[PDB]
């Protein structure tokens, strides 16, 4: 537990949030749905690791814990209902977009135009939200059951 056992995970969250960003602009692939709300979840995970790292040290490592706990558990419940809402789409739906500036203080990763094609070829029998649900358990089940 130094600058590594965090700056690795702090890197590991860029090794997803940009992975995702690739899709937006190369494999366009515009959509968002709750996915923007979910981008945020990992920009919460960053904080944790990047703070558990930058100025490690032994006091601040207690802060990093909870924030490395919150936005992961948050992540799950966001990716979960998001997943649910396919294996179980709800007679109503909406197909909306919209909203400190969420929308404003960045365009290229905080804009959300998922105009609902009731189809996604999210690879390997699992949709992105379906993967991301798992990977978020892989941060929640670390944090608690492999740290505190």
């Amino acid at each position: 537990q130094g600058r590594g056992a965090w700056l690795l995970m702090a890197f590991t969250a860029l090794a997803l949030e940009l992975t995702a960003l690739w899709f937006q602009h190369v494999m366009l692939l515009k959509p968002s749905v709750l996915c923007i709300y979910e981008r945020v979840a990992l920009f919460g995970v960053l904080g944790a690791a990047l703070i558990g790292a930058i100025a490690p040290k032994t006091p601040l490592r207690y802060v990093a814990m909870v924030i490395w706990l919150y936005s992961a558990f948050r992540g799950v419940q966001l990716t979960y209902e998001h997943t649910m809402l396919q294996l179980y789409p709800s007679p109503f739906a909406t197909c909306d977009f919209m909203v400190l500036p969420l929308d404003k203080w960045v365009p290229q990763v905080f804009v959300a135009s998922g105009d609902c094609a009731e189809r996604q070829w999210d690879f390997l029998g699992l949709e992105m939200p379906q993967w991301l649900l798992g990977i978020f358990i892989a941060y929640l089940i670390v944090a608690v059951l492999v740290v505190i």
């Epitope: 396919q86 007679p91 739906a93 189809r119």
Partner: antibody, heavy 115, light 112 residues
Framework: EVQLVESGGGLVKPGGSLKLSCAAS????????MSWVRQTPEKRLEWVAY????????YYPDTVKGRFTISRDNAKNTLYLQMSSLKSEDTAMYYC????????WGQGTSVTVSS | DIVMSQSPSSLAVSAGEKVTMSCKSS????????????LAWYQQKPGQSPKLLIY???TRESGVPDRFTGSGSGTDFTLTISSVQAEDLAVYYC????????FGGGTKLEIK
């Protein structure tokens, strides 16, 4: 095992008002969603309101949107339908239902609108 | 909205037969992701709250005897009750749950 008993409504005048409560009992209430189905005198079946598990979102057919209000209170385990500007179309039996596809239905409170 | 419309209004049958009434919806009820046909069949006994019978279109519900069967797909559903017991006097309602909730008019299965 799982029960629903809606109640509290008889006759009400046009333009009128009146609120019904489904007393829910015998399942993890705060986890399911809730709906309010009525059945007309023709024996016809119209869905009327839908509230989400955590009171978050509600939905209505355009035929009561504005005049009707599906609240819940998982403190006292009740579901509520608050009817306002009452049309004599609203005249029907009022079931309180449970979805996961209405799988446990109530029994009805009849509500009629007349003078 | 979607319009559900069943035929016929009424059916007679001698106790123990096969009956297959039909529910047709105005709008197709299929998702691209999963063959999932978003139609339910509710039975409703004389002066009773409707009971859930079949969901999704095929799949029966906790304590539905195999005899009620749900076929259908797209805009074209059919409910089929083999070996009609006496305690099967009912109106059978189909519901769509693909976009809001709509019901059919009903089909009265009265016994001979």
């Amino acid at each position: 095992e799982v029960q629903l008993v809606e109640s509290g409504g008889g006759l009400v005048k046009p333009g009128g008002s009146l609120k019904l409560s489904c007393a829910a009992s015998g399942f993890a209430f705060s986890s399911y969603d809730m709906s309010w189905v009525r059945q007309t005198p023709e024996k016809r079946l119209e869905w009327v309101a839908y509230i989400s598990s955590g009171g978050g979102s509600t939905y209505y057919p355009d035929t009561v949107k504005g005049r009707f209000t599906i609240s819940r209170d998982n403190a006292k385990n009740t579901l509520y339908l608050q009817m306002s500007s009452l049309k004599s179309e609203d005249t029907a039996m009022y079931y309180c239902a449970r979805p996961d596809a209405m799988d446990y239905w109530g029994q009805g409170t009849s509500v009629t609108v007349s003078s | 909205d979607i319009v559900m419309s069943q035929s016929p209004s009424s059916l007679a049958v001698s106790a123990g037969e096969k009956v297959t009434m039909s529910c047709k919806s105005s709008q197709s009820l299929l998702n691209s992701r999963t063959r999932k046909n978003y139609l339910a069949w509710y039975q409703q006994k004389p002066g009773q709250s409707p009971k859930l019978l079949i969901y999704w279109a095929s799949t029966r519900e906790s304590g539905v005897p195999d005899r009620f069967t749900g076929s259908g797909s797209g805009t074209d559903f059919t409910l089929t009750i083999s070996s009609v017991q006496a305690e099967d006097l009912a109106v059978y309602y189909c519901k769509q749950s693909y976009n809001l909730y709509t019901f059919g008019g009903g089909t009265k299965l009265e016994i001979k």
